[PDB]
Amino acid sequence: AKRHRKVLRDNIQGITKPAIRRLARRGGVKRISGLIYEETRGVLKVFLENVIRDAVTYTEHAKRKTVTAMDVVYALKRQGRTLYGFGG
Template sequence: MGPRSTTGLGMKEARLRRIIFQDIIHGIANPAIRRSSRCGDVNCIAGPNVIRKSLHDFLSKIIRDSIHNSESSERNTITIQDVLYALKKYGRSLYGCDY
């Protein structure tokens, strides 16, 4: 199913559909970026937009590789193992997962 047209919808539903299609990465607020940076012992932050861009790029690569792993296994569901293999490909191993 592709995206539906908004011709049969009321104004409220059309506006809601427009909001959903916006880039979701801007939903990460500045205080959340600051808290995450402080947990990683970062003293100086370049800027929220730079961090959002790098986060978007990193997550795009991981999700793309996870999808590739699940498709090569002929599955429609992405498992934890697919994500772990994608992280391992970029040298970012995740420990604590017993799968």
């Protein structure tokens, strides 16, 4: 059976275990428990869906289908997570 779907759904597992370990090494974490990665994936999904929902709202105010970087900058700016290096 060669049947499979075109749309992939396990891309939250695309944030791999050594990526989360590198993130914690940048955060200064020495030892990591085995249950950390699923919680980190859920937290990343929640944060990403919040920012992307605001960016999509900013895009469809402008009657556009393309999410620009400035919409992401405004979406991060409204929640108090202002980002430099893309505003201009």
